[PDB]
């Protein structure tokens, strides 16, 4: 034995020496040194100091630059809101708790923080998907006489919020549950504990299939198509230097977007899969924090890729950051 179970938590440390306390009641300095808790807090601090400005600016610059307010940008704004949910639901809370050494807000707080952090990360996830779809639709033109307009943009946004609730909401009402994770200072979805009363096993399969494999398939198909369309277009138009550049830039971007989606979610999926395949294993509190590190950091790198690296947003951001103009 190497864990310690409680009514609604799973401390990844054996109580054979009797030192384990509830992660809702007292510091967990026995499953990690106090300094490592400070580094946890340091990391949440970084993600805020970088994460909030990047994502807030994205909304701000949109309020003040007409040209950004197009239907094809809605999903990107959406991405930025998702990131902020992660910032204020997840990151700030975790900065606060890590410095106490445990999840001082109790089980209900655990349900709130876990819900908003998950909602955030999930809306972001499905945004990145919807965006690949919209790009495929607009560029690959797989539908005769179709024009992407405001209404589709809205459906796309609504679709992400529905898919995200499809993930964050069940654990609030019986299908899986939220419980402190890693170092017990933040709450996630229980995907590593065989907990029958809530049906964790079927939920983990559902998550992996509907919320990882599907997204992965849809992204790969769409951007694969796009890279295909663009390679072909350029080959049939080699007299155009510009078209040759677009083909190269678009290919580079797709490699960055796909690799970036992997880095962000592969760890959660990889780890989840291993625990499912190797039922009951010694997994430490720090190692269980790794998948979170990869996902949560996307609140910074996603907007770098999808906003800062977007020519339009960038210019507007530079103009706004440099006072009047530049």
């Amino acid at each position: 034995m190497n864990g310690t179970e409680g009514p609604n938590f799973y401390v990844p440390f054996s109580n054979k020496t009797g030192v384990v306390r509830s992660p809702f009641e007292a510091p967990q300095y026995y499953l990690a040194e106090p300094w490592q808790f400070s580094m946890l807090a340091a990391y949440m601090f970084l993600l805020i100091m970088l994460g909030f400005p990047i994502n807030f600016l994205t909304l701000y610059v949109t309020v003040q630059h007409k040209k950004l307010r197009t239907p094809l940008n809605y999903i990107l704004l959406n991405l930025a809101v998702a990131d902020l949910f992660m910032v204020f639901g997840g990151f700030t809370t975790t900065l606060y708790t890590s410095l106490h050494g445990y999840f001082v807000f109790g089980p209900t707080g655990c349900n709130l923080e876990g819900f908003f952090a998950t909602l955030g990360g999930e809306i972001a996830l499905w945004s990145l998907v919807v965006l690949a779809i919209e790009r495929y639709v607009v560029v690959c033109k797989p539908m005769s006489n179709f024009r992407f307009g405001e209404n589709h943009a809205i459906m796309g946004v609504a679709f992400t919020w529905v898919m995200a609730l499809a993930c964050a909401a069940p654990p609030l009402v019986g299908w899986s549950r939220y419980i402190p994770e890693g170092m017990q200072c933040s709450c996630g979805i229980d995907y590593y504990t065989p907990h029958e009363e809530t049906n964790n096993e079927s939920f983990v399969i559902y998550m992996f299939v509907v919320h990882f494999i599907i997204p992965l398939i849809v992204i790969f198909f769409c951007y694969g198509q796009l890279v295909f369309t663009v390679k072909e277009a350029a080959a049939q138009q080699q007299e155009s230097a510009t078209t040759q550049k677009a083909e190269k830039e678009v290919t580079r971007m797709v490699i960055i977007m796909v690799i970036a989606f992997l880095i962000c979610w592969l760890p959660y999926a990889g780890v989840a899969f291993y625990i499912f395949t190797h039922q009951g294993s010694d997994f430490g509190p720090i190692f269980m924090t790794i998948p979170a590190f990869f996902a949560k950091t996307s609140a910074v790198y996603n907007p770098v890729i999808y906003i800062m690296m977007n020519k339009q947003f960038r210019n507007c951001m530079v103009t706004t950051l440099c006072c009047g103009k530049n």
Partner: peptide, 11 residues
Amino acid sequence: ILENLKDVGLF
């Protein structure tokens, strides 16, 4: 492609 690539912020 070019206009569309601009619209979706990819070029």
